[PDB]
Write a protein that holds these residues in place. Structure first.
Motif, mmCIF file in Angstrom:
data_model
loop_
_atom_site.group_PDB
_atom_site.id
_atom_site.type_symbol
_atom_site.label_atom_id
_atom_site.label_comp_id
_atom_site.label_asym_id
_atom_site.label_seq_id
_atom_site.Cartn_x
_atom_site.Cartn_y
_atom_site.Cartn_z
ATOM 1 N N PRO A 4 24.230 -16.245 -3.187
ATOM 2 C CA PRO A 4 23.888 -15.702 -1.867
ATOM 3 C C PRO A 4 24.892 -14.664 -1.389
ATOM 4 O O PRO A 4 26.107 -14.839 -1.519
ATOM 5 N N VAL A 5 24.371 -13.580 -0.825
ATOM 6 C CA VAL A 5 25.203 -12.560 -0.194
ATOM 7 C C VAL A 5 25.600 -13.050 1.191
ATOM 8 O O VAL A 5 24.751 -13.492 1.973
ATOM 9 N N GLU A 6 26.896 -12.976 1.495
ATOM 10 C CA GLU A 6 27.360 -13.257 2.846
ATOM 11 C C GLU A 6 26.566 -12.432 3.847
ATOM 12 O O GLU A 6 26.257 -11.263 3.605
ATOM 13 N N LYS A 7 26.228 -13.048 4.978
ATOM 14 C CA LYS A 7 25.389 -12.395 5.982
ATOM 15 C C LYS A 7 26.262 -11.635 6.980
ATOM 16 O O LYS A 7 26.403 -11.999 8.149
ATOM 17 N N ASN A 8 26.852 -10.549 6.486
ATOM 18 C CA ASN A 8 27.603 -9.616 7.311
ATOM 19 C C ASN A 8 27.052 -8.211 7.138
ATOM 20 O O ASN A 8 26.779 -7.779 6.015
ATOM 21 N N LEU A 9 26.882 -7.509 8.254
ATOM 22 C CA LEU A 9 26.644 -6.071 8.254
ATOM 23 C C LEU A 9 27.935 -5.384 8.687
ATOM 24 O O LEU A 9 28.418 -5.611 9.801
ATOM 25 N N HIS A 10 28.495 -4.564 7.803
ATOM 26 C CA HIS A 10 29.724 -3.832 8.084
ATOM 27 C C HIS A 10 29.381 -2.378 8.390
ATOM 28 O O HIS A 10 28.821 -1.678 7.540
ATOM 29 N N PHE A 11 29.715 -1.932 9.599
ATOM 30 C CA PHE A 11 29.739 -0.516 9.939
ATOM 31 C C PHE A 11 31.181 -0.071 10.146
ATOM 32 O O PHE A 11 32.086 -0.886 10.337
ATOM 33 N N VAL A 12 31.382 1.246 10.129
ATOM 34 C CA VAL A 12 32.689 1.849 10.351
ATOM 35 C C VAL A 12 32.523 3.002 11.328
ATOM 36 O O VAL A 12 31.633 3.842 11.158
ATOM 37 N N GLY A 55 29.056 -8.972 1.918
ATOM 38 C CA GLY A 55 27.982 -8.571 2.808
ATOM 39 C C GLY A 55 27.347 -7.247 2.440
ATOM 40 O O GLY A 55 27.258 -6.892 1.258
ATOM 41 N N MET A 56 26.891 -6.522 3.465
ATOM 42 C CA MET A 56 26.213 -5.242 3.304
ATOM 43 C C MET A 56 26.883 -4.197 4.181
ATOM 44 O O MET A 56 27.002 -4.389 5.397
ATOM 45 N N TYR A 57 27.310 -3.091 3.570
ATOM 46 C CA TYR A 57 27.831 -1.953 4.310
ATOM 47 C C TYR A 57 26.719 -0.954 4.597
ATOM 48 O O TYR A 57 25.859 -0.697 3.745
ATOM 49 N N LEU A 58 26.775 -0.369 5.792
ATOM 50 C CA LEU A 58 25.818 0.634 6.242
ATOM 51 C C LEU A 58 26.546 1.730 7.004
ATOM 52 O O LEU A 58 27.353 1.437 7.890
ATOM 53 N N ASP A 59 26.266 2.987 6.663
ATOM 54 C CA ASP A 59 26.640 4.086 7.543
ATOM 55 C C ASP A 59 25.872 3.970 8.856
ATOM 56 O O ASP A 59 24.755 3.447 8.901
ATOM 57 N N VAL A 60 26.473 4.475 9.935
ATOM 58 C CA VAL A 60 25.883 4.303 11.258
ATOM 59 C C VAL A 60 24.639 5.149 11.481
ATOM 60 O O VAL A 60 23.975 4.983 12.510
ATOM 61 N N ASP A 61 24.302 6.056 10.561
ATOM 62 C CA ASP A 61 23.085 6.851 10.677
ATOM 63 C C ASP A 61 21.950 6.311 9.808
ATOM 64 O O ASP A 61 20.978 7.029 9.543
ATOM 65 N N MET A 62 22.056 5.062 9.368
ATOM 66 C CA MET A 62 21.009 4.367 8.636
ATOM 67 C C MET A 62 20.243 3.446 9.578
ATOM 68 O O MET A 62 20.763 2.996 10.602
ATOM 69 N N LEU A 63 18.999 3.163 9.217
ATOM 70 C CA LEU A 63 18.119 2.317 10.006
ATOM 71 C C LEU A 63 17.460 1.277 9.116
ATOM 72 O O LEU A 63 17.375 1.455 7.897
ATOM 73 N N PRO A 64 16.982 0.178 9.697
ATOM 74 C CA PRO A 64 16.334 -0.862 8.892
ATOM 75 C C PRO A 64 15.119 -0.329 8.144
ATOM 76 O O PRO A 64 14.546 0.705 8.488
ATOM 77 N N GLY A 65 14.734 -1.066 7.105
ATOM 78 C CA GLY A 65 13.550 -0.705 6.349
ATOM 79 C C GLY A 65 12.275 -0.907 7.141
ATOM 80 O O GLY A 65 12.189 -1.745 8.041
ATOM 81 N N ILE A 66 11.260 -0.117 6.799
ATOM 82 C CA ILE A 66 9.951 -0.195 7.436
ATOM 83 C C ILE A 66 9.114 -1.223 6.692
ATOM 84 O O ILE A 66 9.122 -1.274 5.457
ATOM 85 N N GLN A 67 8.389 -2.044 7.441
ATOM 86 C CA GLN A 67 7.535 -3.045 6.821
ATOM 87 C C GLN A 67 6.648 -2.380 5.767
ATOM 88 O O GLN A 67 5.946 -1.409 6.080
ATOM 89 N N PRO A 68 6.652 -2.861 4.516
ATOM 90 C CA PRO A 68 5.995 -2.094 3.441
ATOM 91 C C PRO A 68 4.506 -1.886 3.645
ATOM 92 O O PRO A 68 3.962 -0.894 3.146
ATOM 93 N N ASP A 69 3.826 -2.785 4.358
ATOM 94 C CA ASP A 69 2.383 -2.687 4.540
ATOM 95 C C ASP A 69 1.986 -1.908 5.789
ATOM 96 O O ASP A 69 0.793 -1.664 5.989
ATOM 97 N N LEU A 70 2.947 -1.512 6.624
ATOM 98 C CA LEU A 70 2.643 -0.888 7.909
ATOM 99 C C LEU A 70 1.686 0.290 7.771
ATOM 100 O O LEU A 70 0.562 0.235 8.274
ATOM 101 N N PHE A 71 2.117 1.358 7.100
ATOM 102 C CA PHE A 71 1.322 2.573 6.970
ATOM 103 C C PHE A 71 0.554 2.633 5.655
ATOM 104 O O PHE A 71 0.160 3.721 5.223
ATOM 105 N N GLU A 72 0.325 1.481 5.018
ATOM 106 C CA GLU A 72 -0.468 1.432 3.795
ATOM 107 C C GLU A 72 -1.825 2.109 3.955
ATOM 108 O O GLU A 72 -2.414 2.537 2.956
ATOM 109 N N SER A 73 -2.332 2.225 5.183
ATOM 110 C CA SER A 73 -3.640 2.819 5.424
ATOM 111 C C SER A 73 -3.610 4.338 5.545
ATOM 112 O O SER A 73 -4.678 4.964 5.513
ATOM 113 N N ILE A 74 -2.437 4.947 5.678
ATOM 114 C CA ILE A 74 -2.327 6.384 5.907
ATOM 115 C C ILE A 74 -1.903 7.038 4.598
ATOM 116 O O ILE A 74 -0.766 6.869 4.143
ATOM 117 N N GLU A 75 -2.816 7.797 4.000
ATOM 118 C CA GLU A 75 -2.527 8.528 2.774
ATOM 119 C C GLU A 75 -1.603 9.703 3.071
ATOM 120 O O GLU A 75 -1.714 10.348 4.116
#
Ligand SMILES: O=c1ccn([C@@H]2O[C@H](COP(=O)(O)OP(=O)(O)O[C@H]3O[C@H](CO)[C@@H](O)[C@H](O)[C@H]3F)[C@@H](O)[C@H]2O)c(=O)[nH]1
Length: 541
Positions: free
Chosen positions: A92-100, A281-301
């Motif tokens: 298991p990955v430790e549940k930390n989000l590290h920003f700087v 844990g997981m490192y993230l630059d502050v200009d990153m955003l969470p992932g989009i639900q994979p099925d959200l725009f499945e209807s838009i070609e």
């Protein structure tokens, strides 16, 4: 899965040729590897490393041996076994989000990006690393560089309409002036840090700014107060309490980038990998955003006329236009879509009520004790996103890569600099030294080291990438797969790296903020800057 002892005696022999001690060593180490049920993943890897070293010894001792073909395939098998080891034993990955955010006050836009991660990962502890000693670096760099802009334009205050005063020429001259001012500061810093070794960075900075640029200490102190207050109210973690980092070999590099070169991206590069090594844990630059639900725009070609990148940016811009999670988010690309397509976006997003249906969560992640996982884009791997269990083997390999790269850098840079010469002369000395040490195994890297003095001050200077950024990660992965340390010439192909890549579903990288770099700028941006600076100088401001 890896062949056993007899399976390899079958691969290597000719009846006539004898079995040497250098061959038996391989045999024994292989047998031992297949009796390691009591041992950890890292121990198994270290045993494969021993095996590989022994095999190389044999091949190099009996250069034309008929075994060498069999053993050479054996090495391929070893690499394969390493990848199996990596993939089949996860923890298991430790549940930390590290920003700087270091160097100055943190911006509301960064906070707003971070808060989305918070909103969809309530089970994660969030750190925003700051340096309570160094809130004034960005102010120092901005003051110096603006003074330099002014002195340059004043030096050219009657050639402004001369088409020979190109933005290129402007940035060359300005670079000269920046070097002089920057060395002035660095020398003051070293002196003060000599007659008082525990003076903190911000004290020296603020007295410098007062002496040389007529800034009011009181105002700078208020600024420090407000920055500390703000980051304390947004999950701040003081670097000055991260004891293992402070006490380590790499801290001198962190402070070299922070205090001397004013490159907060490089300092963040050096800090992030230590955060992963010591905490996990997981490192993230502050200009990153969470992932989009994979099925959200499945209807838009996707329209045939649009790039994949463009489409990603428009996904996010649609989310923000209709849900407004982040204020004042651009709609530049979404607005270019057909009215029917835009309508499709509006419909899909209208069917959704909660953020959990838009952005996905990280949940229970796991990874190999051997690996650090890294994000990727069209350009290649990119350390704006990283995942690692505490003290993974690759995190240590990466720390070592960075340390060696800075050793090569400083062995040539420091002598050049201690000759008290100007920018062009210092540049020429430093380049000469780098070239004298360049060779077949390091050419690309050294070529990029030759630009180091210009980072942050001149267009298209990307040395950080090769020093503390992705190239060190690629080199570390190669070290892992080559059972060695210190690779300088990367021969991996993208397929090789795919084993170490973060799933695209776990980060949204095509954000508005990504587009504008904080430590680098390209030619168009440089040109715009030049033209605006001319206008501001004309009008006084
Ligand atoms: O004043 C400041 C300015 C910036 N930073 C830090 O620098 C980080 C990187 O900013 P950003 O996206 O601009 O860099 P990027 O352009 O993508 O460069 C890449 O390559 C860079 C070097 O490899 C790497 O740093 C980056 O992660 C890559 F994607 C930012 O997330 C902060 O942690 C800071 O702390 N204080």
């Amino acid at each position: 899965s890896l062949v056993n002892r007899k399976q390899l005696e079958k691969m290597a022999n000719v009846r006539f040729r004898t079995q040497e001690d250098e061959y038996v060593a391989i045999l024994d180490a292989l047998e031992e590897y297949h009796n390691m049920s009591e041992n950890t993943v890292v121990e198994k890897y270290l045993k494969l490393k021993d095996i590989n070293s022994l095999t190389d010894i044999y091949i190099d001792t009996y250069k034309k041996s008929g075994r060498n073909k069999a053993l050479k395939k054996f090495k391929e098998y070893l690499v394969t076994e390493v990848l199996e080891l990596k993939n089949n034993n996860l923890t298991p990955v430790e549940k930390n989000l590290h920003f700087v955010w270091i160097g100055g006050q943190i911006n509301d836009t960064a906070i707003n990006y971070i808060n989305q991660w918070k909103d969809v990962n309530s089970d994660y502890n969030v750190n925003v690393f700051y340096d309570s000693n160094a809130f004034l670096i960005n102010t120092l760099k901005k003051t110096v560089v603006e003074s330099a802009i002014n002195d340059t334009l004043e030096s050219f205050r009657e050639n402004l309409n001369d088409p020979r005063f190109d933005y290129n020429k402007f940035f060359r001259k300005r670079m000269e002036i920046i070097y002089d001012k920057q060395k002035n500061f660095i020398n003051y810093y070293k002196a003060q840090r000599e007659e008082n070794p525990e003076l903190i960075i911000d004290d020296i900075v603020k007295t410098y700014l007062s002496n040389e640029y007529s800034k009011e200490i009181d105002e700078l102190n208020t600024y420090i107060e407000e920055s500390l207050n703000k980051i304390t109210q947004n999950s701040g973690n003081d670097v000055r309490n991260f004891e293992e980092f402070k006490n380590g070999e790499s801290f001198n590099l962190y402070e070299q980038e922070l205090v001397e070169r004013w490159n907060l991206a490089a300092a963040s590069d050096i800090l992030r990998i230590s955060a992963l090594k010591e905490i996990g844990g997981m490192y993230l630059d502050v200009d990153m955003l969470p992932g989009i639900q994979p099925d959200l725009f499945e209807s838009i070609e996707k329209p045939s006329s649009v790039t994949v990148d463009f489409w990603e940016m428009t996904k996010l811009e649609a989310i923000m236009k209709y849900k407004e999670y982040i204020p004042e988010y651009t709609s530049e690309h979404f607005d270019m879509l057909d009215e029917e397509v835009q309508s499709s976006f509006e419909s899909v997003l209208a069917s959704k009520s909660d953020k959990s249906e838009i952005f996905s969560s990280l949940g229970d992640m796991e990874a190999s004790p051997l690996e650090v996982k890294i994000a990727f884009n069209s350009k290649g791997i990119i350390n704006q996103g990283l995942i690692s269990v505490k003290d993974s083997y690759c995190s240590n390999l990466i720390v070592k890569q960075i340390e060696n790269r800075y050793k090569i850098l400083n062995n040539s840079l420091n002598p050049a600099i201690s000759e008290d010469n100007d920018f062009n002369t210092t540049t020429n000395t430093f380049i000469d030294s780098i070239m004298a040490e360049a060779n077949a195994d390091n050419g690309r890297f050294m070529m990029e080291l030759g630009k180091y003095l210009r980072v942050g001050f001149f267009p298209d200077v990307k040395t950080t990438i090769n020093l503390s950024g992705p190239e060190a990660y690629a080199a570390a992965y190669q070290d892992l797969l080559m059972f060695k340390e210190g690779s300088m010439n990367i021969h991996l192909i993208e397929a090789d790296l795919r084993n170490f890549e973060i799933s695209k579903t776990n980060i949204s990288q095509s954000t508005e903020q990504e587009m504008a770099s904080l430590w680098s700028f390209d030619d168009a941006r440089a040109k715009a800057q030049f033209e605006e600076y001319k206008r501001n100088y004309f009008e006084g401001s």
